[PDB]
Amino acid sequence: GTPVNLAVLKLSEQGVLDKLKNKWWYDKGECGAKDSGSKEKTSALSLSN
Amino acid sequence: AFTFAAFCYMLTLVLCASLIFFVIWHIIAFDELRTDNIERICCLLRKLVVPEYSIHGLFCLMFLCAAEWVTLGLNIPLLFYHLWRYFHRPADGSEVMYDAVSIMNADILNYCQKESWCKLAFYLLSFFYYLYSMVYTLVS
């Protein structure tokens, strides 16, 4: 308990665990992140109509 | 996916299929000149000149608005040619150009005969080039 409890405290301010929060999540926008280019939600008719 | 640029390819196929029909009277009336009347073919072919040039002036304006930097380049020497073939020639000043009724002067019949198979060359493969980039954008 307490070695791992003192680890996660140490792992916090070193910045390692939240680097691991990045490490497996930061690069995983390989889908394309199509939500990024869609925040207008425009409501005019387009050519498609 | 119908886009604005894809409409610019649909419109030019409507118009360049007439632009090949403008220059089919370029070669058939020259065939009437080589077989023979001159001021008849002068009065005819003088008329349809600013149509076959300023319709080409439309597309160079059009693909700029369509932001197609490829196809804007693939006709801009012809607009440079259409401008250059124009501005020296209306020195006669009757209506526009291309006949100057004493057309029977030498070396200008064959130089325009070079241009006869130059327009019929360029307009044809570009007609299948606009149909190429139509289908390229319309179902992408």
Is B86 an interface residue toward A (CB < 8 Å)?
A: no
User: Cα separation of B110 and B25, whole Å?
Assistant: 16
Q: Which of residues 5-44 of B touch A (CB under 8 A)?
A: 7
B85-103 core/surface letters (b: 16 or more CB in 10 A; e: else): beeeeeeeeeebbbbbeeb
Beta carbons within 8 Å of B51's beta carbon, 6+ residues apart: B22
At B18, list the tokens: 């007439």
Instruction: Please answer whether residues B138 and B1 qualify as being in contact, where contact means their C-beta atoms are separated by less than 8 angstroms.
Output: yes
How long, in residues, is chain B? Answer: 140
Interchain CB distance below 8 Å, B7 and A47 = yes
Q: How far is CA B46 from CA B94, B104, B105, B123, in A?
A: 9, 15, 17, 20
- Evaluated on CA atoms B36, B40, B45, B48, the torsion sign reads negative
* DSSP symbols for A7-42: HHHHHHHTT-HHHHHHHTTSS--TT--TTGGGTT--
- The DSSP letter of residue B99 is -
Obtained via which technique? Answer: cryo-EM
Q: For residue B4, list chain A residues with Cβ-Cβ distance below 8 A.
A: 47
Count of Cβ atoms closer than 10 Å to residue A14 Cβ: 10
Q: Which of B75, B81, B51 is nearest to B62 (CA)?
A: B75
Residue A45 zone, left/alpha/beta (φ > 0; ψ -120 to 50; rest): beta
